[PDB]
Design an enzyme around this catalytic site. Structure first.
Site, PDB file in Angstrom:
ATOM      1  CE  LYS A  55      58.559 -10.341  39.522  1.00 47.46           C
ATOM      2  NZ  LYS A  55      59.560 -10.210  38.506  1.00 47.46           N
TER       3      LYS A  55
ATOM      4  CG  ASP B  90      62.638  -5.065  32.290  1.00 44.09           C
ATOM      5  OD1 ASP B  90      62.794  -4.186  31.660  1.00 44.09           O
ATOM      6  OD2 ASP B  90      61.752  -5.092  33.204  1.00 44.09           O
TER       7      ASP B  90
ATOM      8  CG  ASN C 170      64.553  -5.596  36.520  1.00 41.36           C
ATOM      9  OD1 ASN C 170      63.979  -5.330  37.442  1.00 41.36           O
ATOM     10  ND2 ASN C 170      63.914  -5.350  35.066  1.00 41.36           N
TER      11      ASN C 170
ATOM     12  CG  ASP D 172      61.663  -8.184  36.443  1.00 44.00           C
ATOM     13  OD1 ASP D 172      60.988  -8.988  35.636  1.00 44.00           O
ATOM     14  OD2 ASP D 172      61.458  -6.946  36.388  1.00 44.00           O
TER      15      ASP D 172
HETATM   16  N1  LIG Z   1      65.809 -11.347  45.134  1.00 40.83           N
HETATM   17  C1  LIG Z   1      65.549  -9.888  45.039  1.00 40.83           C
HETATM   18  N2  LIG Z   1      66.684  -9.045  45.746  1.00 40.83           N
HETATM   19  C2  LIG Z   1      66.592  -7.954  45.837  1.00 40.83           C
HETATM   20  N3  LIG Z   1      65.540  -7.121  45.515  1.00 40.83           N
HETATM   21  C3  LIG Z   1      64.694  -7.845  44.801  1.00 40.83           C
HETATM   22  C4  LIG Z   1      64.593  -8.919  44.562  1.00 40.83           C
HETATM   23  N4  LIG Z   1      63.539  -9.469  44.037  1.00 40.83           N
HETATM   24  C5  LIG Z   1      62.734  -8.361  43.861  1.00 40.83           C
HETATM   25  N5  LIG Z   1      63.544  -7.014  44.234  1.00 40.83           N
HETATM   26  C6  LIG Z   1      63.270  -5.719  44.496  1.00 40.83           C
HETATM   27  O1  LIG Z   1      61.804  -5.520  44.040  1.00 40.83           O
HETATM   28  C7  LIG Z   1      61.608  -4.780  42.676  1.00 40.83           C
HETATM   29  C8  LIG Z   1      60.460  -5.471  41.879  1.00 40.83           C
HETATM   30  O2  LIG Z   1      61.100  -6.898  41.451  1.00 40.83           O
HETATM   31  P1  LIG Z   1      61.061  -7.405  40.108  1.00 40.83           P
HETATM   32  O3  LIG Z   1      61.506  -8.794  40.188  1.00 40.83           O
HETATM   33  O4  LIG Z   1      61.814  -6.635  39.285  1.00 40.83           O
HETATM   34  O5  LIG Z   1      59.432  -7.134  39.701  1.00 40.83           O
HETATM   35  P2  LIG Z   1      58.867  -6.778  38.479  1.00 40.83           P
HETATM   36  O6  LIG Z   1      58.811  -7.853  37.403  1.00 40.83           O
HETATM   37  O7  LIG Z   1      57.457  -6.166  38.755  1.00 40.83           O
HETATM   38  O8  LIG Z   1      59.838  -5.443  38.278  1.00 40.83           O
HETATM   39  C9  LIG Z   1      63.024  -4.919  42.225  1.00 40.83           C
HETATM   40  O9  LIG Z   1      63.128  -3.904  41.315  1.00 40.83           O
HETATM   41  C10 LIG Z   1      63.917  -4.751  43.360  1.00 40.83           C
HETATM   42  O10 LIG Z   1      64.195  -3.432  43.750  1.00 40.83           O
HETATM   43 MG   LIG Z   2      61.648  -5.580  37.554  1.00 43.69          MG
HETATM   44 MG   LIG Z   3      59.454  -7.200  35.411  1.00 44.28          MG
END
Ligand SMILES: Nc1ncnc2c1ncn2[C@@H]1O[C@H](COP(=O)(O)OP(=O)(O)O)[C@@H](O)[C@H]1O
Ligand SMILES: [Mg+2]
Ligand SMILES: [Mg+2]
Ligand SMILES: Nc1ncnc2c1ncn2[C@@H]1O[C@H](COP(=O)(O)OP(=O)(O)O)[C@@H](O)[C@H]1O
Ligand SMILES: [Mg+2]
Ligand SMILES: [Mg+2]
Lengths: 263, 263
Positions: free
Chosen positions: A43, A189, A194, A207
């Protein structure tokens, strides 16, 4: 030479097949790194969000602090590189809630899950929590986001039936109607995208940029909003509160839901 | 007071229900405005992309110039507002190419469609074309994008087996290996997401930021890329060229496909 990730981080992920997450619900860039024996997630957030609740560095601090407290991914590598905050983490354990309850008529299951989350949160000792996301801090951040055009634009806010005519109008209201706060651990959130579930129990949270100290009604309001968005039956809202065993404070709930319309 | 769209534009889209496009393939913000009489589309690009082939203003100019020349949406409203370039346009006619082919295996129909577009593009009189997207112009903006970290989000560029260690190496290559050019009308991003079909024939073209004068092999290379990653069989590439009535110039094709990597 100019890269968004360091040579060290590049080496750690070269062997993986990069598949960019399609959601893009935040200014962060999310990448699933498909490996032979596991997947990792990277991320990234640019300098404009440095220090804000959108900064993934924030999100690493909470991930580290939350280890042993809540089911969160493991921090494999973090770094600041040319303005970018880069977080390489393990894949969350279990099934994404939005997937687990996707095409499934059982709003009650996610309600039970939210109730479980709120319960777990109230048990987390926040005495040494890295961040305090009280309204003073959130509003000061929102003010900065608005002034720099970094706040998310809910295109639905352009529709004629929307109460507040512009972001500032909403901000002035938030600033004026700021309710009293009682700080507990807050995810920030609490949405089905998440949260992860495995065998009925919550298996993972991600998140975490807005995670830290915040009023209890913040996450609770989020849940009320989610319940109403998925189903037009207010009965499920009452079910949620029955499960929490508390009386809804509608003034605080309305407030936090409003605060979210700028995030 | 402070908003991304002017009160006039806001007034024009009030009656519409916004549905943000989920693709997000470019820095542009795309919104579908669902109404009772018709649907409109609102495309927006921020200040950082001003003057580049991403700038919707440029796209608007090309959209205006192409009226009567190619099936393109009608420009309903354009404005520069608080750094943003906003374009309100009519919904394209026909079915999205990626949708008409969705799962139904009909490769030759897509091959014929791509062939039709190239022949159509070559019949266009560019004597008064608003923009010339020569390699000098494209590389010049690419240099700017890289210098300001606005060039395409490296994901696959991070993988081990990639030919160029970094964006600059790729850029330098393009700069040195710059082929000769024979300018014709060029769409700039010929693909199933930017093309619409009705009755087997092309009914609409959108995403016109990079449209203008450019070498003929640019769009052709994009079709080759589309055929390979969308259809799969190399025989359909041979078919594509049979229909075009020309032999493929692989040196140029590789070059142009490579040119789009950083965009
Ligand atoms: N560590 C992780 N394990 C599994 N899925 C993840 C992980 N990090 C991100 N994702 C996937 O990607 C999507 C976006 O990540 P997220 O951290 O929620 O970013 P944002 O802040 O844009 O929502 C999540 O909804 C999930 O589907
Ligand atoms: Mg998210
Ligand atoms: Mg987010
Ligand atoms: N005028 C339009 N009519 C119909 N669909 C449109 C229109 N403009 C955009 N879209 C839809 O939204 C998507 C993104 O728009 P596009 O202009 O291609 O933005 P980008 O440059 O990010 O690809 C297109 O693939 C198409 O599905
Ligand atoms: Mg497009
Ligand atoms: Mg585009």
């Amino acid at each position: 030479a100019k890269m968004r990730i360091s040579p060290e981080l590049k080496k750690l992920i070269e062997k993986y097949r990069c598949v960019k997450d399609t959601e893009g619900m935040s200014p962060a860039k999310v990448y699933k790194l498909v490996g032979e024996n596991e997947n990792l997630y990277l991320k990234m957030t640019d300098s404009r969000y440095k220090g804000t609740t959108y900064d993934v560095e924030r999100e690493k601090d909470m991930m580290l602090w939350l280890e042993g407290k809540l089911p969160v991914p493991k921090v494999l590598h973090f770094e600041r590189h040319d303005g970018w905050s880069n977080l390489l983490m393990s894949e969350a354990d279990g099934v994404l809630c939005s997937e687990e309850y996707e095409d499934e008529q059982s709003p009650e299951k996610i309600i039970e899950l939210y109730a479980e989350c709120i319960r777990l949160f109230h048990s987390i000792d926040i005495s040494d929590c890295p961040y305090t996301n009280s309204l003073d801090s959130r509003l000061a951040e929102l003010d900065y986001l608005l002034n720099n055009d970094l706040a998310d634009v809910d295109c639905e806010n352009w529709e004629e039936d929307t109460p507040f005519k512009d972001p500032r109008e909403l901000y002035d209201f938030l600033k004026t109607e700021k309710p009293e706060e009682e700080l507990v651990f807050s995810h920030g959130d609490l949405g089905d995208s998440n949260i992860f579930v495995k065998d009925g129990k919550v298996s993972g949270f991600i998140d975490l940029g807005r995670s830290g100290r915040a009023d209890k009604w913040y996450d609770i309001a989020f849940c009320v909003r989610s319940i109403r968005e998925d189903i037009g039956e207010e009965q499920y809202v009452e079910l949620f509160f029955d499960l929490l065993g508390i009386k809804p404070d509608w003034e605080k709930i309305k407030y936090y839901i409003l605060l979210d319309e700028l995030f």
